[PDB]
Every structure is written in C-alpha cells, then in structure tokens.
Design an enzyme around this catalytic site. Structure first.
Site, PDB file in Angstrom:
ATOM      1  N   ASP A  98      44.366  29.766  51.438  1.00 35.55           N
ATOM      2  CA  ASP A  98      44.349  30.089  49.890  1.00 35.55           C
ATOM      3  C   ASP A  98      45.223  31.314  49.249  1.00 35.55           C
ATOM      4  O   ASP A  98      45.484  31.775  48.531  1.00 35.55           O
ATOM      5  CB  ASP A  98      42.826  30.871  49.945  1.00 35.55           C
ATOM      6  CG  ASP A  98      41.764  29.884  50.050  1.00 35.55           C
ATOM      7  OD1 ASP A  98      41.630  28.915  49.081  1.00 35.55           O
ATOM      8  OD2 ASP A  98      40.459  30.412  50.217  1.00 35.55           O
ATOM      9  N   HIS A 140      41.786  42.917  47.781  1.00 32.93           N
ATOM     10  CA  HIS A 140      41.263  41.791  48.243  1.00 32.93           C
ATOM     11  C   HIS A 140      41.809  42.113  49.844  1.00 32.93           C
ATOM     12  O   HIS A 140      42.150  41.804  50.995  1.00 32.93           O
ATOM     13  CB  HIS A 140      41.815  40.601  49.306  1.00 32.93           C
ATOM     14  CG  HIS A 140      40.407  40.153  47.291  1.00 32.93           C
ATOM     15  ND1 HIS A 140      38.658  40.235  47.813  1.00 32.93           N
ATOM     16  CD2 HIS A 140      39.538  39.355  46.153  1.00 32.93           C
ATOM     17  CE1 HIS A 140      37.882  40.134  47.420  1.00 32.93           C
ATOM     18  NE2 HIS A 140      38.630  39.571  46.351  1.00 32.93           N
ATOM     19  N   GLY A 148      42.465  36.343  49.365  1.00 33.31           N
ATOM     20  CA  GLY A 148      41.877  35.629  48.361  1.00 33.31           C
ATOM     21  C   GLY A 148      43.122  35.847  47.512  1.00 33.31           C
ATOM     22  O   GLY A 148      43.085  36.351  46.078  1.00 33.31           O
ATOM     23  N   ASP A 175      34.755  43.389  39.395  1.00 33.57           N
ATOM     24  CA  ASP A 175      35.136  42.227  40.097  1.00 33.57           C
ATOM     25  C   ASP A 175      34.431  41.335  40.268  1.00 33.57           C
ATOM     26  O   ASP A 175      33.427  42.203  41.112  1.00 33.57           O
ATOM     27  CB  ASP A 175      36.630  41.993  40.657  1.00 33.57           C
ATOM     28  CG  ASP A 175      37.145  40.398  40.973  1.00 33.57           C
ATOM     29  OD1 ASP A 175      36.231  39.932  41.459  1.00 33.57           O
ATOM     30  OD2 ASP A 175      38.414  40.187  39.913  1.00 33.57           O
ATOM     31  N   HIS A 177      34.196  39.640  42.700  1.00 31.20           N
ATOM     32  CA  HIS A 177      33.897  39.221  43.755  1.00 31.20           C
ATOM     33  C   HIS A 177      33.546  41.188  44.463  1.00 31.20           C
ATOM     34  O   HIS A 177      34.471  42.497  43.850  1.00 31.20           O
ATOM     35  CB  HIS A 177      35.371  39.133  44.123  1.00 31.20           C
ATOM     36  CG  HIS A 177      35.530  37.523  44.039  1.00 31.20           C
ATOM     37  ND1 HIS A 177      35.844  37.298  42.957  1.00 31.20           N
ATOM     38  CD2 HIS A 177      34.970  36.477  44.367  1.00 31.20           C
ATOM     39  CE1 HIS A 177      35.556  36.109  42.705  1.00 31.20           C
ATOM     40  NE2 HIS A 177      35.232  35.705  43.880  1.00 31.20           N
ATOM     41  N   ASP A 268      36.200  37.677  35.847  1.00 29.87           N
ATOM     42  CA  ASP A 268      35.860  36.547  37.159  1.00 29.87           C
ATOM     43  C   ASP A 268      34.082  37.017  36.450  1.00 29.87           C
ATOM     44  O   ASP A 268      33.846  35.981  36.718  1.00 29.87           O
ATOM     45  CB  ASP A 268      35.339  36.284  37.647  1.00 29.87           C
ATOM     46  CG  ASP A 268      36.139  37.537  38.805  1.00 29.87           C
ATOM     47  OD1 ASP A 268      36.043  38.385  38.634  1.00 29.87           O
ATOM     48  OD2 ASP A 268      37.108  37.012  39.756  1.00 29.87           O
ATOM     49  N   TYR A 312      39.692  33.440  35.706  1.00 31.86           N
ATOM     50  CA  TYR A 312      40.562  31.926  35.711  1.00 31.86           C
ATOM     51  C   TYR A 312      40.087  31.381  34.294  1.00 31.86           C
ATOM     52  O   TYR A 312      40.854  30.677  34.671  1.00 31.86           O
ATOM     53  CB  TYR A 312      39.770  31.655  37.120  1.00 31.86           C
ATOM     54  CG  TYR A 312      40.419  32.227  38.250  1.00 31.86           C
ATOM     55  CD1 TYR A 312      41.858  32.843  39.085  1.00 31.86           C
ATOM     56  CD2 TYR A 312      39.323  34.126  38.460  1.00 31.86           C
ATOM     57  CE1 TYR A 312      41.613  33.706  40.156  1.00 31.86           C
ATOM     58  CE2 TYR A 312      39.399  34.191  39.616  1.00 31.86           C
ATOM     59  CZ  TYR A 312      40.903  34.115  40.379  1.00 31.86           C
ATOM     60  OH  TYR A 312      41.108  35.080  41.666  1.00 31.86           O
TER      61      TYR A 312
HETATM   62  O1  LIG Z   1      38.970  36.266  42.403  1.00 27.72           O
HETATM   63  C1  LIG Z   1      38.984  36.792  43.488  1.00 27.72           C
HETATM   64  C2  LIG Z   1      39.112  36.004  44.584  1.00 27.72           C
HETATM   65  C3  LIG Z   1      39.546  34.094  44.386  1.00 27.72           C
HETATM   66  C4  LIG Z   1      39.698  33.423  45.459  1.00 27.72           C
HETATM   67  C5  LIG Z   1      39.158  33.730  46.614  1.00 27.72           C
HETATM   68  C6  LIG Z   1      39.356  32.337  47.569  1.00 27.72           C
HETATM   69  C7  LIG Z   1      39.991  31.390  47.329  1.00 27.72           C
HETATM   70  C8  LIG Z   1      39.824  30.974  46.292  1.00 27.72           C
HETATM   71  C9  LIG Z   1      40.524  32.036  45.039  1.00 27.72           C
HETATM   72  S1  LIG Z   1      40.679  31.972  43.436  1.00 27.72           S
HETATM   73  C10 LIG Z   1      39.345  30.936  42.413  1.00 27.72           C
HETATM   74  C11 LIG Z   1      37.807  30.992  43.205  1.00 27.72           C
HETATM   75  C12 LIG Z   1      37.256  29.732  42.692  1.00 27.72           C
HETATM   76  C13 LIG Z   1      37.582  29.318  41.265  1.00 27.72           C
HETATM   77 CL1  LIG Z   1      35.942  28.691  40.149  1.00 27.72          CL
HETATM   78  C14 LIG Z   1      38.263  29.756  40.315  1.00 27.72           C
HETATM   79  C15 LIG Z   1      39.483  30.169  40.984  1.00 27.72           C
HETATM   80  N1  LIG Z   1      38.955  37.627  43.944  1.00 27.72           N
HETATM   81  O2  LIG Z   1      39.088  39.193  43.063  1.00 27.72           O
HETATM   82  K   LIG Z   2      33.708  44.548  42.376  1.00 27.19           K
HETATM   83 ZN   LIG Z   3      37.301  38.108  40.853  1.00 30.64          ZN
END
Ligand SMILES: O=C(/C=C/c1ccccc1Sc1ccc(Cl)cc1)NO
Ligand SMILES: [K+]
Ligand SMILES: [Zn+2]
Ligand SMILES: [K+]
Length: 391
Positions: A98, A140, A148, A175, A177, A268, A312
């Site tokens: 990734d 991250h 990420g 975020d 995440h 997101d 995204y």
């Molecule tokens: O945003 C993030 C991390 C994004 C991310 C992490 C691991 C793998 C891919 C991604 S990027 C991703 C993942 C899923 C979808 Cl549905 C669309 C994009 N944190 O701040």
């Molecule tokens: K957060």
């Molecule tokens: Zn995120």
C-alpha cells in the site's frame, strides 16, 4: 489572518501521486471558484538552505536510513530497470504494497512536510491565527516505516516545530482512521496531547486506537494518560458523532489549555466516501460533524493548524474542505461568508455532476461508557501533570 498553504510547484507535487491524483487541485480550485482566496493569506511551503538542512529537519522524527531509502526509492522509480537487495531494503521500511514507489514519491512526501512546517512557522510568528494545509495530514507514517500511503509524517514534524517554539499542543484527529503515527510519536510526551476519533473494528486499518478484560493504553512514562482515543461503530451520523466528540473537545481544552491546536480533518468519514463506514456530511443549515467540531475548536481562540488527510471521494472531499475553509474565515475574521448551494463554473466543474450542488448527495451506552473512561483519563492526566481546573 487565515493562512492557506499553496503554490504552483506545491500543487504539481501534491497532484503527482497515483493514489490521490488531482484531489489537491480540485480542493484548491473549488476554494478559488467560491472566491475564498482573496480572503486568505497564502503560506508558501518551506524550502531549505541545503540537503543537510533538509535532512536535519526531516530526521527530527524519521531515521536517516528511512529517509535515505525513500530518496533511493524515488531515484529507482526514475529509471525503468529493482534488484533483490533493493527490494529487501524497501521491504524493511514497508516501502511496498500500500506504500509503493513512484517517480516523485520523495518529492511528493517532502512537499507535505514543507507545507506543514511553513504553516507552523506562520502560527509561531503570529502572522496567522489559523493556517490550513490541504496537502498535509499524513498521520500514519512512523519513524522508519511508511504506512497507509503516508511516507513522511508532516503532522509530527509540524507539532515538533510548535513545541520547540510552557508550550502544550492539543492534536485532534478527525480522520476515519486512528491517527497512530502522531500518537506513537508523542507516546512519552505530556506536552503534546493526542485525541483521535475513528472507526475501529477487527481487521480494519491500522488496528489501533481501541481496546488492547483488555484495556486502553494511553501513553507511557511522563506521557501516561496523554493519548486519547474514541473508537466508534460504523454507521454513525452527524448528530451522534458530534455529541460523541463535543464534550471531549471542550474538556480537553479546559484542562490542557493548549498553546496550539493541530486538527487533522481527513474527509473519509463522509457518508459518500468509498469507505461507506461513517455517515457524516458537509451540510451547514443537521450540521456537518466536521463543521461542528471545527467551529467548536475555533471558538477557543487558540492559534490553530488545519490539515487534510484521507478522502477518497475527491469532489466531496473538496465540497467539505471548501466549507471548512469558508467557516474558518467566518470564525476567525468575523466576516460573513456566503456560499451558493450550486458549484460555480470553473476548471473542474464537470467533476461535480450530475447535480453540481455543494451539499454532498446523501439522504441521512457505548459512548456514555467511553465518556466516563475518557473523563477519568483526563483527571489522571491532570493529576500527573499538576494541572489546575474545576472538576
Ligand atoms: O485514509 C487512510 C488510509 C488509507 C488506506 C490504508 C490502507 C490501505 C489503503 C488505504 S487507501 C483506501 C482504502 C480503502 C478505500 Cl475504500 C479507498 C482508499 N488513513 O488516513
Ligand atoms: K482519527
Ligand atoms: Zn483515513
Ligand atoms: K502524548
């Protein structure tokens, strides 16, 4: 004044990654399209005197070996030819999967640092009351690990610049995440208090920010009780998220009394993000969870850094960040900002179809136990750090 980081080469770098494509360009041109730019002071990204000075700045957090490998990844992706030893090297820094290489991976990653370092300098010297960097927020990245699609942690370096300017930083992570890289970086520092609200569930990235009967870790050493987390179930809406985080935000402000506030505003959690986990909106009449929290944070009158991050659905990320920027101008300058509900004509107008409206196209006990837990952590943190406040 409200500052915003941009520039011609900064835009071209922020738009050079395969993951985020031209998102930064849509955000900045929608902000432009809404005539917000004359109201904002442009903060130019930082540049350095020499390679050594760049390395000195970036390795205030990252290792030299990790920075070396990231620069070498970029040069290797600028020739067509990777060897077994170079792949092993990159694997040892998680520069794979990734977090792949690409021809500007280093220049792209450094740009966010340049943006967010310059943003903190504008706050430190009080040229700006708030600075926005929509090219930043890469929470991250670790000292020696990409994670990420975060390669260099501009948030950590920016916060480091703030503390080195008593000084206390409140970091707020909106975020979807868990903000694990910023949290881990200040695990042992009471002066930087970290707060992330996020989804967390078994197998969901990055896995942290939740129970670990297990318990919540929250810092170590003199930083004990200084890392706060609120993991929330999928499906939460503007109202339930806002009531979840609102009292925690006010509480942290009262007790910690931060010198600066750093906000990561990853987009997101939008109901229209391809993640489809949270159901937040950019509505501004119920009220966007993001806008609620930003307006709250800004009502504290603390010099504040606003960063981007995830997001995204690129047009809807622009829809949200445009309203966030407009709100920040309103709250800081005390000047009404009128935003037409329809997208103005401009370069990327076609990306906002088929309705071309500024609202995103969406029809809208666990927390009480977390509030008591987090209340207790704050009292534990205030006792440990000899802080005065009314129970
Ligand atoms: O945003 C993030 C991390 C994004 C991310 C992490 C691991 C793998 C891919 C991604 S990027 C991703 C993942 C899923 C979808 Cl549905 C669309 C994009 N944190 O701040
Ligand atoms: K957060
Ligand atoms: Zn995120
Ligand atoms: K901390």
């Amino acid at each position: 004044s409200v500052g915003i980081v941009y520039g011609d080469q900064y835009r071209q770098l922020c738009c050079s990654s395969p993951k985020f494509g031209d998102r930064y360009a849509l955000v900045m041109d929608l902000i432009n399209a809404y005539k917000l730019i004359p109201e904002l002071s442009r903060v130019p990204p930082l540049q350095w005197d020499s390679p050594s000075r760049m390395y000195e700045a970036v390795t205030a957090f990252h290792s030299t070996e990790y920075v070396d490998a990231l620069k070498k990844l970029q040069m290797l992706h600028c020739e067509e030819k990777l060897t077994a030893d170079d792949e092993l090297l990159m694997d040892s820094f998680s520069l794979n999967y990734d977090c792949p290489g690409f021809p500007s991976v280093f220049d792209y990653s450094l740009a966010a640092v340049q943006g967010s370092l310059a943003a903190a300098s504008a706050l430190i010297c009080r040229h700006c009351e708030v600075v926005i960097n929509w090219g930043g927020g890469w929470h991250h990245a670790k000292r020696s690990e990409a994670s990420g699609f975060c390669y260099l942690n501009d948030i950590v370096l920016a916060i480091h610049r703030l503390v080195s300017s008593q000084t206390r930083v409140l970091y707020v992570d909106l975020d979807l995440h868990h903000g694990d890289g910023v949290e881990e970086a200040f695990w042992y520092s009471p002066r930087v208090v970290t707060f992330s609200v996020h989804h967390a569930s078994p197998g969901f990235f990055p896995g942290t920010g939740t129970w670990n009967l297990p318990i919540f870790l929250n810092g170590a050493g003199r930083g004990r009780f200084s890392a706060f987390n609120l993991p929330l179930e999928e499906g939460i809406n503007d109202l339930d998220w806002s009531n979840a985080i609102g009292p925690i935000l006010d509480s942290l402000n009262i007790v910690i009394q931060p010198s600066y506030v750093v906000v990561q505003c990853g987009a997101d959690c939008l109901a229209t993000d391809p993640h489809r986990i949270f159901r937040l909106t950019n509505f501004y009449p119920s009220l966007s969870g993001y806008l609620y929290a930003i307006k709250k944070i800004l009502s504290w009158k603390v010099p504040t850094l606003i960063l981007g991050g995830g997001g995204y659905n690129f047009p809807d990320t622009a829809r949200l960040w445009t309203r966030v920027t407009a709100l920040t101008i309103e709250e800081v300058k005390g000047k009404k900002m009128t935003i037409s509900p329809e997208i103005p004509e401009h370069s990327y107008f076609s990306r906002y179809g088929p309705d071309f409206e500024l609202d995103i196209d969406y029809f809208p006990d666990s927390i009480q136990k977390h509030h008591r837990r987090i209340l207790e952590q704050l009292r534990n943190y205030a006792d440990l750090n000899k802080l005065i406040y009314d129970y």
